[PDB]
Design a binder for this molecule. Structure first.
Ligand SMILES: [Mg+2]
Ligand SMILES: [Mg+2]
Lengths: 154, 154
């Protein structure tokens, strides 16, 4: 593997003819309260709009997935809860190695009081708005919505 | 936006301090038959392993999402079916603009008879194997699994 670029959040390398973007692993947190899911929105220059996502971020040096999940939840929403590991996925294995570890958060407590907008919304409504073309989803946002519809309903 | 690299499936640009990877949009197809979901696996140099995915691929010039979905299903699995658009998502809006359009395929018919391995598997079993750390998921594979558990069960 030969490198063409070493950046802040990514490296661009060539492995033969394959173009590979190395990227730090990430975490995402699914949280439900009173039937609303905890979504967040922020300007995303890469896409030119603010898609509906769930608390997420990169895992930093020294941190493991669970710890990063805690930090991202607190830094983006000011909350903490009991986290449980759910599953993981590669965002787009065809060109990048970014892997995302998803956690479920329960018994949320506000521990703190912005570039990131906190958007509490019933998953049913998020799905409907998307179907109506009013909002876009990030992989984490869609995963949160589908996960809810599959195992957390009522 | 200034470009540092123009490749085959991606461009690397800088928008101020933001590192942005331009990528063609993609499609993914969820298909269930006799309780098994249509997964596919292939060597993915970017991740160094073969994660569990569902039929997917890039949308080529002149093609719209629905047409690309048809092609990817036929080229990777040799099947065709009645496709319905479900939803879309940005794989990782923090650095790339790759957007994936997901479709549901029903009434599958084999129209044709490999780098891509066809893996029919009950979603329940795919989820269990993943939980056991025996298989990894791509975003498309996980989305397929969660979608099934949420709206196609029985
Ligand atoms: Mg961070
Ligand atoms: Mg193709």
């Amino acid at each position: 593997r030969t490198y063409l670029y070493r950046g802040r959040i990514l490296n661009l390398a060539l492995e033969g003819r394959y173009e590979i973007v190395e990227h730090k692993p990430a975490v995402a947190v699914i949280a439900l309260r009173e039937g609303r899911m905890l979504f967040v929105r922020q300007m995303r220059p890469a896409v030119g709009l603010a898609p509906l996502e769930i608390p997420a971020g990169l895992i930093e040096p020294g941190e493991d997935p669970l710890e990063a999940a805690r930090r991202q939840l607190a830094e983006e929403t000011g909350l903490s809860g009991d986290l449980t590991y759910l599953f993981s996925y590669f965002v787009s294995p065809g060109f990048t190695d970014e892997k995302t570890h998803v956690f479920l958060a329960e018994n949320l407590k506000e521990v703190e009081a912005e570039a990131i907008e906190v958007v509490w919304m019933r998953p049913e409504e998020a799905l409907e708005r998307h179907q109506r073309g009013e909002v876009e989803f990030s992989a984490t946002g869609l995963v949160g919505v589908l996960y809810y519809h599959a195992f957390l309903r009522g």
